[PDB]
């Protein structure tokens, strides 16, 4: 059922989006790295959803940012056609666990949670080839995430920062 509307505004990213490229300790040195980074002083399409074609292209990677506190946001969906003819992700978070499945989901036009049944996300999945369960990622505050994939490896970075009253 279509009940979501969306508007877009534009703003800048300033000096944000730097992550540790490798898990090796370094101190008092300047290191030159080459990888997928968010360039300085770039567009960031501030999306506002109120209650719609939210099939946003992925391209090389995605930097996601959220400043809300009510935790109305949860989980993500990934795919190439968002249909049952191709496999898709179902990264979904709640207050206790995160489940990650790769399967041929039949995604609806707009997916959501009734809150707590995901019947409106997909109709039925048949051939699943990957399942995973872990502790949920999400825990006046800004939450930043980086998603990318290289050589069949999906990598997710995150960070939590305190932000004062700034628009």
């Amino acid at each position: 059922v279509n009940l979501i509307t969306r508007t877009q505004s534009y703003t800048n990213s300033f000096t944000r989006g730097v992550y540790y490229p490798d898990k090796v300790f370094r101190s008092s040195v300047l290191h030159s790295t080459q990888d997928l980074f968010l360039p300085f002083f770039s567009n960031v399409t501030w999306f506002h959803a109120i209650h719609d074609n939210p099939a946003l292209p992925f391209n090389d990677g995605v930097y996601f940012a959220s400043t809300e506190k009510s935790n109305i946001i949860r989980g993500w969906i990934f795919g190439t056609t968002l249909d049952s003819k191709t496999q898709s992700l179902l990264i979904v978070n709640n207050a206790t666990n995160v489940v990650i499945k790769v399967c041929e989901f039949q995604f609806c036009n707009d997916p959501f949670l009734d809150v707590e049944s995901e019947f409106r996300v997909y109709s039925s999945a048949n051939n699943c080839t990957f399942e995973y369960v872990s502790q949920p990622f999400l825990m006046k505050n800004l939450r930043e995430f980086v998603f990318k994939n290289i050589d069949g490896y999906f990598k997710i970075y995150s960070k939590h920062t305190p932000i004062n009253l700034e628009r």
Partner: nanobody
């Protein structure tokens, strides 16, 4: 193609209102500063208003209370609001922007009759 293009000039009687607008082909985010200069026939250039990247805004002594300079992040441009014009406001205006070198524009000959 030229980067900074200006518009909003013409003849306007005293006490009216007008809108000056200069648009840049490059994104207005990296320009790091945008200023409006004006000069009158036979006089030297003086700064009217300036806005930096962060959001700090500054004006001149004879500019406060009548002029407002602001930019929107939809079409990359900077707008100046001409309010409570007098005879001495008649001049030629040009906007300036410096990322790592200065870029200038021309035009916008505004005249006030009294």
């Amino acid at each position: 193609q030229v980067q900074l293009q200006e518009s909003g000039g013409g003849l306007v009687q005293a006490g009216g209102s007008l809108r000056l607008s200069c648009a840049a082909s490059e994104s207005i985010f990296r320009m790091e500063l945008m200023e409006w200069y004006h000069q009158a026939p036979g006089k030297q250039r003086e700064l009217v208003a300036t806005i930096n990247r962060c959001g700090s805004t500054n004006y001149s002594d004879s500019v406060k209370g009548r002029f407002i300079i602001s930019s929107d992040n939809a079409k990359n441009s900077v707008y100046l609001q001409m309010n409570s014009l007098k005879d001495e406001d008649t001049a030629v205006y040009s906007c300036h922007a410096r990322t790592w070198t200065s870029y200038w524009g021309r035009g916008t000959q505004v005249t006030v009759s009294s």
